[PDB]
Scaffold this active site. Sequence first.
Site: not given
Length: 116
Positions: A23, A47-48, A72, A88, A90
């Site tokens: 990621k 991702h977060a 990615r 992502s 998010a």
Amino acid sequence: LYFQSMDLALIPDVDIDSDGVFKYVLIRVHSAESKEIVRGYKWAEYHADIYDKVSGDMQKQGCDCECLGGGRISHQSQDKKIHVYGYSMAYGPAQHAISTEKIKAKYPDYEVTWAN
């Protein structure tokens, strides 16, 4: 008084891992006067997780962050290829063209590609 802001020049434009798929996020850092940076790590489940780590670090230096998206990165050191792609949930998909601009600046002898 006056407060001296972090010189963004001293914040690495790219910090990514090697040999594998992981990621990444594209982050706008504000001094806060702003620039986009690429951050990608194999240890991140989400991702977060990357954004939380990075934005925490930035906040320690008096900078504020925005996440512009993610995806990615496939880094193959053997073949000197880096591919940037995906999304992502998010943060949405990053504009991987920006990410690759950064990446290519740091790995100029690599083939640096994106999709989308």
